[PDB]
């Protein structure tokens, strides 16, 4: 039995940029051609608690990361092409 | 400009246990008498892609982790489910 101390938990759960898995379809729903391999990507995005419900965990600095994704025409063609995805370099607890 | 190569992305996105932030309410609704600080916890849970939509990313080995959480006001321990090992199994 091991107990993570209050202040350890509060600190590591606090609003920060964290490796987050994001479905490529949910990101780009306008997609009527290609099934994606991988189906999802690991993106550094904001996430975590904020001290009081008044504040929300929001990104202060944003940017794109570029990844070789396999685009599959399920019956027809299939190739590796690059796709950009939003990522969050820095985050904050800001009032809603 | 920098490009992550296909096989790097496929591998890192693959079904694995990953630090996942989980709202303490959404886990335990039966506690409607308390506000929690922190509001959420970082838990090792399954997550990621599976090669084809037929399979779903599921836990093979499960267990509890214990954390000092502030219930509003006293600090008391709470167990949370965590996922030690994961797999791509057919739905």
């Amino acid at each position, epitope marked *: 039995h*091991e107990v*993570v101390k209050f202040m*350890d938990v509060y600190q590591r759960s606090y609003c920060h940029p964290i490796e987050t898995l994001v479905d490529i379809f949910q990101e780009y729903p306008d997609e009527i051609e290609y099934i994606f391999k991988p189906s999802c990507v690991p993106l550094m995005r904001c996430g975590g608690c904020c001290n009081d419900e008044g504040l929300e965990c929001v990104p202060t600095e944003e940017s794109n990361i570029t990844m070789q994704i396999m685009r599959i025409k399920p019956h027809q063609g299939q190739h590796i092409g690059e796709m950009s995805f939003l990522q969050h370099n820095k985050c904050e607890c800001r009032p809603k | 400009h920098e490009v992550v190569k296909f*096989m790097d992305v*496929y*591998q*890192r996105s*693959y079904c*694995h*246990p990953i*630090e996942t932030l989980v709202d303490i309410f959404q886990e335990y609704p039966d506690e409607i008498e308390y506000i929690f600080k922190p509001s959420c916890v*970082p838990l*090792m849970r399954c997550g990621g892609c599976c090669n084809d939509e037929g399979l779903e990313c599921v836990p*093979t080995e499960e267990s509890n*982790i214990t954390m000092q959480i502030m219930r509003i006001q006293h600090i008391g321990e709470m167990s949370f489910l965590q996922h*030690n*090992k*994961c*797999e791509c199994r057919p739905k």
Partner: antibody
Amino acid sequence: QLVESGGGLVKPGGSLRLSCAADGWWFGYTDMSWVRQAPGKGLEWVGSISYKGGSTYYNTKFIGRFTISRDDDTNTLYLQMNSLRAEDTAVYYCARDDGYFDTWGQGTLVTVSS
Amino acid sequence: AIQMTQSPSSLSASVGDRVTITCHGSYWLSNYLAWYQQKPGKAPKLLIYDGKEREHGVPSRFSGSGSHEDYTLTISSLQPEDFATYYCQQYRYHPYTFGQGTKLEIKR
């Protein structure tokens, strides 16, 4: 104890199967890992297989490309390796998986070269 | 993926010295941690498992400790045969991850 065969020379891109023979029935009742180690560099878990065979698992840089197989009759563990590069030149150890690794083979050397 | 950070890379001690090797995990591991001794040319030998449990036959001068993230192999009275390379290994969360290694050199 545990005895690895299959190791030796392989062309880049080429495939190789490692077999590892365990001496006793106990093999049938434990998880089984492979750990590898590049010359002079350190240890690195490859992958494991579960007790009945229900589940296989892989370290990140092997997910697309290695398959772990197990024959609970002959008491033999297998590692199929495909798409081999220099990076994969290493001693490959068969080992008893229980979280920690209480039993190792002596390991076999897979050399990837032209 | 839990990142293990072993220290130092290497070190150098005389016979009889107490030696310390540290291991830090990126998440709380709750003693799901082992220490391995590897002598040159041969497979790893398990020393410590479950953080502080000593494998049968391992001398009493090798001891394990720590909790949460931070763990410590202690070789109490260093011997000439303890010349080896020590690794820590996490096994709480797949994939199993080891430290980078600690190459121990004897002075004389």
